[PDB]
Amino acid sequence: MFEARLVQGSILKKVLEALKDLINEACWDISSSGVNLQSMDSSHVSLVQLTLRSEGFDTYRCDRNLAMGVNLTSMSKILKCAGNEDIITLRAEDNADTLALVFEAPNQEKVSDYEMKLMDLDVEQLGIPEQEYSCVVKMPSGEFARICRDLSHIGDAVVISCAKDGVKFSASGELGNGNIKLSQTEAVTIEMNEPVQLTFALRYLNFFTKATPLSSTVTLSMSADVPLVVEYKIADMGHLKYYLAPKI
Amino acid sequence: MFEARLVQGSILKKVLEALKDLINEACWDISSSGVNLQSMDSSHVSLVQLTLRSEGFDTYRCDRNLAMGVNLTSMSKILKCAGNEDIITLRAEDNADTLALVFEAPNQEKVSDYEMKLMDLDVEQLGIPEQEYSCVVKMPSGEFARICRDLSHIGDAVVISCAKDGVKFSASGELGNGNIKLSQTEAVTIEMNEPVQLTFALRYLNFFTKATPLSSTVTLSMSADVPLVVEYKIADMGHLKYYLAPKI
Amino acid sequence: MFEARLVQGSILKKVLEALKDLINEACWDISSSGVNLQSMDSSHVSLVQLTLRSEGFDTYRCDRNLAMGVNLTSMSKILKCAGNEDIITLRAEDNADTLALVFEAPNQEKVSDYEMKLMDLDVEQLGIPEQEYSCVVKMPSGEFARICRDLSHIGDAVVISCAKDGVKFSASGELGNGNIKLSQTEAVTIEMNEPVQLTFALRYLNFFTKATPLSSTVTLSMSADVPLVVEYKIADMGHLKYYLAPKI
Ligand SMILES: N[C@@H](Cc1cc(I)c(Oc2ccc(O)c(I)c2)c(I)c1)C(=O)O
Ligand SMILES: N[C@@H](Cc1cc(I)c(Oc2ccc(O)c(I)c2)c(I)c1)C(=O)O
Ligand SMILES: N[C@@H](Cc1cc(I)c(Oc2ccc(O)c(I)c2)c(I)c1)C(=O)O
Ligand SMILES: [Cl-]
Ligand SMILES: [Cl-]
Ligand SMILES: [Cl-]
Numbered sequence A, B, C: 001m002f003e004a005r006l007v008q009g010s011i012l013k014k015v016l017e018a019l020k021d022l023i024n025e026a027c028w029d030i031s032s033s034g035v036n037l038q039s040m041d042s043s044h045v046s047l048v049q050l051t052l053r054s055e056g057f058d059t060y061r062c063d064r065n066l067a068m069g070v071n072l073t074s075m076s077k078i079l080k081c082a083g084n085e086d087i088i089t090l091r092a093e094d095n096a097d098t099l100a101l102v103f104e105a106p107n108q109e110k111v112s113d114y115e116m117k118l119m120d121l122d123v124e125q126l127g128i129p130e131q132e133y134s135c136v137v138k139m140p141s142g143e144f145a146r147i148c149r150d151l152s153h154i155g156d157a158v159v160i161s162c163a164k165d166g167v168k169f170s171a172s173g174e175l176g177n178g179n180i181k182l183s184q185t186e187a188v189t190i191e192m193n194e195p196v197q198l199t200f201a202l203r204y205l206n207f208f209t210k211a212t213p214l215s216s217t218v219t220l221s222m223s224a225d226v227p228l229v230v231e232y233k234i235a236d237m238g239h240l241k242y243y244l245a246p247k248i
Helices: A010-017 A072-079 A141-151 A202-214 B010-017 B072-079 B141-151 B202-214 C010-017 C072-079 C141-151 C202-214
Strands: A002-006 A025-031 A034-040 A047-053 A059-061 A066-071 A087-092 A098-104 A110-117 A135-140 A157-162 A166-172 A176-183 A189-192 A196-201 A217-222 A228-234 A238-244 B002-006 B025-031 B034-040 B047-053 B059-061 B066-071 B087-092 B098-104 B110-117 B135-140 B157-162 B166-172 B176-183 B189-192 B196-201 B217-222 B228-234 B238-244 C002-006 C025-031 C034-040 C047-053 C059-061 C066-071 C087-092 C098-104 C110-117 C135-140 C157-162 C166-172 C176-183 C189-192 C196-201 C217-222 C228-234 C238-244
Touching (some): A010 A047, A010 A072, A010 A202, A066 A072, A072 A098, A072 A110, A135 A141, A141 A166, A141 A202, A141 A217, A157 A217, A196 A202, A202 A238, B010 B047, B066 B072, B072 B098, B135 B141, B141 B157, B141 B166, B141 B176, B141 B202, B157 B217, B196 B202, B202 B228, C010 C072, C010 C202, C066 C072, C072 C110, C135 C141, C141 C176, C141 C202, C141 C217, C157 C202, C157 C217, C196 C202, C202 C228
Antiparallel strands (some): A002 A087, A025 A066, A034 A047, A047 A238, A087 A098, A110 B176, A135 A189, A135 A217, A157 A166, A166 A176, A176 C110, A228 A238, B025 B034, B025 B066, B034 B047, B047 B238, B087 B098, B110 C176, B135 B189, B157 B166, B157 B196, B166 B176, B217 B228, B228 B238, C002 C059, C002 C087, C025 C066, C034 C047, C047 C238, C135 C217, C157 C166, C157 C196, C217 C228, C228 C238
16 A cells, blocks of 8 residues: 655656656556666666655655556656646555556645556566776766767767866767866766776767756766766655666 | 727737637628627637727727638738737728738837738628526636646546536546646636536647636636636737537 | 967857858868858858958967868857857868867866868859948847848748838738838938838848847848848957848
């Protein structure tokens, strides 16, 4: 008998806006500890992982663990019916076939309730390994978004080169090439053990940056021979992480 | 020798913006009492009725009654050439083949004049019956627009249920369903003799809401077995009314 | 060994935004005196001429005269990677095959450098004759843009009639016709020896007005039997001029 009330409901709005173009359908793993989503994107390239801890909700209750199969476009459409000031409650019965979503304001003059048909998805839980990241860059999320958008007018791929002093983003294509150098100082901070130079598809990074509204900061974690992790903190609640294998 | 000067010319701009998607061609009935338009929309579903009383114009003169056949897209295009601060004069000769439109500002530094070819439309005047509306809801026009837009992402039709205490808008479709409850308190006011529950096509309501800029308030009048009336007041001048039969 | 530093880099951004829809490819004539571009548009109708004098750059150096063949769409794409506050340096070696563009800010926290492949274009320099313009209209660039946009909803051509007292823009098409009268007074100023009445394609004027951000003023120079000149000053630096033959 799952139920979860989130006074800052706009977090859910932004979460769906940051998932709906990447994933068509995904399983929401609901448990005592919180809400978790894990899915490969629809092209089977990147893996997206969302954590929303029970403690970041204003009320939270989960009697039995649920795997809720959700069409993300549908859920996105329903969440567009919530205002940015709305208190949002999620509610599903045991062995649920629908998810209820209730939107309200403090003044209770407008109350909306939606019911979303769930899907049957017997998806398996993938193991996400832990890695030693020889290089971790924290920077303003908006500057990251800007760089990925700008450089995708030049080529399809971005070389990210990281050293103690600064981080460089480079691209090349038909028209020529470019590179963008950010020095360490919102700040740019680099925690690095060994320099890395890795190449990534801009198409996928430009999908990840739809998470920009969740945080003014993004963390890029990278190491040779493992996926890049692009991490947006969801304040006092958890995170959205995107994983992208370098181009080999 | 029709002539009409409207210092608040932006009213005409908004009137055309609220008609041009619904109607291709329509007759402007000009008479001593004022300007009236009546037309079925281009799909022959809803009826639109505009009243602009002679008294709301700053000057007004009509020697002989005229039926001006107008392509509304064309008139819309000409009215887009008026600024929002413009004084607008309409002028047509007796047995007119063209309508003149003059746009000016107080400072007279820019004066525009347009001439629009009229059309030949021998359309008959339809009788719009009077009805007893067992239920009349006054609410903010923007909230009405929001609800119709939001709910049309859920289904094609909206059930409007009205009672003393409040008004509910519901929709259902493939993805699931939703309902939006507004309580009586811009306010929400309900004057009702008997509860109504009626169903309407959202496609047409979303056309009516293009009239939103004419008023901060909309009036919904409904009764069993007669069209819904969606009414936008045009301050100190008249109205724009849209009529839509429930789905049966 | 050409190099040019422009602290107000946004001038270059606006220059490219005012050329890229009109011209695909064009030669940048670089010399001691400054940067000049001359090209027929891609339809071979209008001629565009850009002058940026060496003196308007913060530093300027040109060892040998260069004709740089540039795809303007490509250069436009690179200049979109510059911020509006950016210092912009252009750099090309002798007998250059690439153009370097460096973007920086005062605080040097972000430095970008791009390299653009040049093209081989053995275009000849066209002689632009001098003419006696019997009529010169100075007016606000935004009002010019407004008029050309508005009137292009009425017809494809604009009749520009100029007299001592004022300037009139007229258009006619299927729906009817219109004219817009501006009186002499940002001001409207007319210096005229003889009245002119000339007709011009609105499609091309609406391309010229993409230069609007370079200046709050536009100068229209016209005479019977020679092209209209539409001139946008590039403050303390030079100009962008567009030439358009009247319709005959
Ligand atoms: N589904 C894909 C395989 C695939 C599986 C997983 I688990 C992924 O996530 C991570 C995350 C962090 C890591 O360090 C690693 I190593 C992998 C990704 I990116 C791809 C296929 O079909 O090959
Ligand atoms: N033209 C349509 C018929 C049609 C005629 C009329 I008059 C209409 O307006 C109203 C307005 C208020 C009312 O109470 C009623 I009853 C009808 C409408 I909506 C439709 C056809 O072809 O059947
Ligand atoms: N390229 C075109 C010819 C063409 C050549 C030139 I030089 C042009 O510029 C001007 C500018 C100011 C003037 O007074 C004149 I006279 C011409 C233009 I407009 C057109 C063709 O192929 O016929
Ligand atoms: Cl991988
Ligand atoms: Cl009816
Ligand atoms: Cl010519």
